C-alpha cells in the first residue's frame, strides 16, 4: 500500500516534469539532463509547500 503511494508519487512527478521539459520535442541535450533534475526538485518542493499548508492548523 505504501509502495503504491510512492509509485504514484514518482509516476506523477515524471509525467508533469516531462511535459514541461520536452515541450518543443527537440532531442535532449546535456543541459536538458539537469533541467529535468531541476523540475523534479521544484515538483517535490511544491508538494512540500502544498501539503504543509493543507495540514496547517486552522
Amino acid at each position: 500500500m505504501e509502495q503504491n503511494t510512492t509509485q504514484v508519487f514518482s509516476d506523477l512527478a515524471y509525467k508533469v516534469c516531462f511535459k514541461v521539459i520536452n515541450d518543443k520535442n527537440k532531442p535532449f541535450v546535456l543541459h536538458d539532463e539537469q533541467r529535468l533534475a531541476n523540475c523534479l526538485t521544484r515538483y517535490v518542493e511544491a508538494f512540500n509547500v502544498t501539503s504543509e499548508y493543507f495540514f496547517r492548523e486552522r
Binding site: P27, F28, L36
Partner: protein
C-alpha cells in the same frame, strides 16, 4: 551471466507503454494509413530517445532522494 525478475520485466514494459503513449499523443502518429511517414518516424525516434534519457534521470533522482532520506 545476469538474471532478471518478472517485476523488473513488467517495469520495463511499463516504461515502454509510457513512452509509446506520450510519443503517439505528441507526434500524432495515428494520422496515416497504417504506415508511418518519414517525418512521423523521425519524431518518434527523437521522442523515444528523450524518454530513455528522461526515465533514467528520473530513476536516478528518486533513488538518490530515497538514499538521502535514508542516511
Amino acid at each position: 551471466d545476469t538474471e532478471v525478475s518478472n517485476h523488473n520485466y513488467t517495469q520495463a514494459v511499463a516504461y515502454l507503454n509510457r513512452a509509446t503513449s506520450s510519443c503517439v499523443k505528441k507526434c500524432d502518429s495515428l494520422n496515416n494509413n497504417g504506415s508511418l511517414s518519414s517525418k512521423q518516424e523521425s519524431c518518434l525516434k527523437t521522442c523515444a530517445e528523450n524518454h530513455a534519457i528522461a526515465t533514467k534521470i528520473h530513476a536516478e533522482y528518486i533513488r538518490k532522494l530515497a538514499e538521502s532520506k535514508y542516511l
